[PDB]
Amino acid sequence: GADYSAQWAEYYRSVGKIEEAEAIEKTLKNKQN
């Protein structure tokens, strides 16, 4: 699997941005393509 906007979305999980991370976390979704 690719997984890119997840590594970045991981930081938000600890930078009190776990919520905003959902956004940048949606970019990691690399299953369809």
* CB proximity list for 11: less than 8 A, separation 6 or greater: 17, 21
Q: Are 21 and 9 in contact (CB under 8 A)?
A: yes
Q: In Å, how far are 16, 17, 20 from 7, measured between CA atoms?
A: 15, 13, 14
Which amino acid is it at 1?
Answer: G
The helix/strand/coil state of 17 is coil
Q: At 5, list the tokens.
A: 């906007």
Alpha helices in 1-33 (DSSP H): 7-12, 18-26
Which amino acid is it at 23?
Answer: A
- Residue identified by tokens 């890119």 is 4
The helix/strand/coil state of 30 is coil
Q: Are 21 and 12 in contact (CB under 8 A)?
A: yes
